[PDB]
Amino acid sequence: MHIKRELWGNLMVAARSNNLEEVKKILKKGIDPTQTNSYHLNRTPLLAAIEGKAYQTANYLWRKYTFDPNFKDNYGDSPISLLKKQLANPAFKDKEKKQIRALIRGMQEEKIA
């Protein structure tokens, strides 16, 4: 309860910082990273990874769990729309933008299992 909320907050930080080893350790304790709620602002660690430019962690999460890439948080951002905002932002470099584009493509176009 308190424990799950403390783990969730640490999971958001680990994902935003691309600390995939610590993400994996927390998810082994039974947290479903795809499910969220009001209290957590309807965010997930997939969003956290995207906004931290933690693209390898975002890729892992996307591949290993079933996320809805159009599910919005309480700011109104989904994984896809947040990536699209990054892709349009001039501060992002070519190497980052190629990774962003590949994640958008995978989320919009890949098969639903």
Side-chain angles (χ1 to χ4, degrees), residues 3-113:
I3 311 165
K4 291 316 174 171
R5 283 176 173 181
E6 172 185 22
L7 289 169
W8 182 272
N10 286 345
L11 173 61
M12 292 294 285
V13 171
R16 193 179 296 110
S17 59
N18 215 17
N19 194 336
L20 182 56
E21 293 166 0
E22 183 66 10
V23 170
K24 286 173 175 175
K25 284 185 33 94
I26 294 166
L27 298 184
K28 270 215 206 172
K29 300 184 181 314
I31 305 295
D32 179 347
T34 72
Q35 295 313 117
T36 183
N37 58 29
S38 173
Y39 182 78
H40 295 306
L41 310 180
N42 281 138
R43 313 196 85 214
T44 66
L46 177 57
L47 281 189
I50 290 163
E51 73 188 351
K53 306 190 301 186
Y55 299 119
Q56 306 99 311
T57 293
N59 276 106
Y60 173 91
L61 288 169
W62 174 254
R63 187 58 66 230
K64 285 292 172 192
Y65 298 92
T66 304
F67 282 91
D68 174 358
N70 297 109
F71 181 73
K72 293 178 292 298
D73 75 3
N74 287 354
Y75 299 91
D77 300 322
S78 63
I80 288 162
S81 77
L82 188 62
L83 284 161
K84 281 180 177 273
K85 284 188 59 153
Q86 291 188 333
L87 189 63
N89 182 332
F92 283 78
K93 167 198 145 22
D94 294 347
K95 207 189 264 282
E96 290 162 340
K97 285 167 65 162
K98 283 296 199 174
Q99 182 56 248
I100 289 161
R101 273 192 183 94
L103 281 160
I104 295 164
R105 182 194 65 66
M107 291 178 186
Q108 292 193 312
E109 305 184 31
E110 284 169 7
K111 173 185 181 170
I112 180 175

